[PDB]
């Protein structure tokens, strides 16, 4: 999650301006989103043309 | 010899780093070398920096 990156994220979910103005602001949340049978409410897209 | 296709390793997700220098992963589809040799061995985790 930066400008200039690339990965199955950065395109095919979120990508970013190269010009990018702002802050990325990040925290762990493995006390509140992982759960144990783990959480699958939560999808990313693997593939795209 | 023969025809390379990096997209295959670049998009597969098992690897831990894909740094290229010089170049980059997207490009290497629309070139080509007259030889490519592979550089293969065991380091430390902590010694994939150096």
Do not use: H, M
Not at chain 1, 9 to 37: E, H, Q, R
Request: glycine content about 8%.
């Amino acid at each position: 999650i930066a400008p200039g990156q690339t990965g199955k994220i950065a395109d095919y979910n979120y990508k970013l301006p190269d010009d990018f103005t702002g802050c990325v602001i990040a925290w762990n949340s493995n006390n509140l989103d992982s759960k144990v049978g783990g959480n699958y409410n939560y999808l990313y897209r693997l593939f795209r043309k | 010899n023969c025809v390379a296709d990096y997209s295959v390793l670049y998009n597969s997700a098992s690897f831990s780093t894909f740094k290229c220098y010089g170049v980059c992963p997207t490009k290497l589809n629309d070139l080509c070398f007259t030889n490519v040799y592979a550089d293969s061995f065991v380091i430390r985790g902590d010694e994939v920096r150096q």
